Enzyme design. Sequence first.
Site, PDB file in Angstrom:
ATOM      1  N   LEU A  44      15.215 -11.223   0.194  1.00  0.00           N
ATOM      2  CA  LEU A  44      16.264 -10.833   1.120  1.00  0.00           C
ATOM      3  C   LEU A  44      17.085 -12.057   1.495  1.00  0.00           C
ATOM      4  CD1 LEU A  44      17.551  -8.752   2.998  1.00  0.00           C
ATOM      5  CD2 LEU A  44      15.810  -9.342   4.717  1.00  0.00           C
ATOM      6  N   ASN A  66      -2.593   8.203   8.128  1.00  0.00           N
ATOM      7  CA  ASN A  66      -1.796   7.632   9.207  1.00  0.00           C
ATOM      8  C   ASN A  66      -0.644   6.789   8.662  1.00  0.00           C
ATOM      9  OD1 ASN A  66      -1.493   5.224  11.426  1.00  0.00           O
ATOM     10  ND2 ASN A  66      -1.972   7.201  12.373  1.00  0.00           N
ATOM     11  N   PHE A 105       5.447  -8.223   2.911  1.00  0.00           N
ATOM     12  CA  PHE A 105       6.570  -8.694   2.109  1.00  0.00           C
ATOM     13  C   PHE A 105       7.762  -7.756   2.252  1.00  0.00           C
ATOM     14  CE2 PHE A 105       7.792 -11.306  -1.656  1.00  0.00           C
ATOM     15  CZ  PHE A 105       8.856 -10.570  -2.121  1.00  0.00           C
ATOM     16  N   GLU A 142       9.321  -4.600  -6.657  1.00  0.00           N
ATOM     17  CA  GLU A 142      10.594  -5.178  -6.245  1.00  0.00           C
ATOM     18  C   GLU A 142      11.592  -5.353  -7.375  1.00  0.00           C
ATOM     19  OE1 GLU A 142      11.517  -5.493  -3.306  1.00  0.00           O
ATOM     20  OE2 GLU A 142       9.700  -5.545  -2.091  1.00  0.00           O
ATOM     21  N   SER A 195      -2.954   2.443  12.318  1.00  0.00           N
ATOM     22  CA  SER A 195      -3.314   2.271  10.911  1.00  0.00           C
ATOM     23  C   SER A 195      -4.189   1.043  10.725  1.00  0.00           C
ATOM     24  CB  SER A 195      -2.048   2.088  10.075  1.00  0.00           C
ATOM     25  OG  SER A 195      -1.233   3.246  10.075  1.00  0.00           O
ATOM     26  N   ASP A 224      19.567  -4.144  -1.478  1.00  0.00           N
ATOM     27  CA  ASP A 224      18.235  -3.546  -1.509  1.00  0.00           C
ATOM     28  C   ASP A 224      18.288  -2.084  -1.059  1.00  0.00           C
ATOM     29  OD1 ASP A 224      18.214  -3.565   1.311  1.00  0.00           O
ATOM     30  OD2 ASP A 224      16.637  -5.068   1.473  1.00  0.00           O
TER      31      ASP A 224
END
Length: 161
Positions: free
Chosen positions: A32, A132, A104, A11, A117, A20
């Site tokens: 965010l 996947n 996250f 990040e 998945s 972002d």
Amino acid sequence: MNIFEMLRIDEGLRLKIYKDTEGYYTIGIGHLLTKSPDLNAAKSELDKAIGRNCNGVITKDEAEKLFNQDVDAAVRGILRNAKLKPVYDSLDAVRRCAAINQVFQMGETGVAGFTNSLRMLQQKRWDEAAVNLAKSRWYNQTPDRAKRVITTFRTGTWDAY
């Protein structure tokens, strides 16, 4: 390596409001602020999050405080999601970090929709799960970060970091 060092790599750290990868106002270590295109709305969210009038800028300590809160909220959200909790609890510690990283970035609702998945992960079919997982908007839009997270799910090692 741990979840904090991992997400810090993925990040970054920026002390001024920035956009972002999706164009959304963000600050700190991937915090965010809002999906609104109005910078004033983002500044209002920042001030509310920090508890003072920041005018779009925070300190490293403040960034790390939001990061601690955001990581904690991400994992607690996993535990409070009936679809994600059994998969998470089935994982070893390193793969749990990959799970937190996904939530996250994507939000718990986006992750819980990864039904096929998640099943492969719970089944410990690691290479199939990795194949996947890459068949996704997530991977196509952030392929280098997604590749690191997927390698973590696939191997249970920190080799990608």
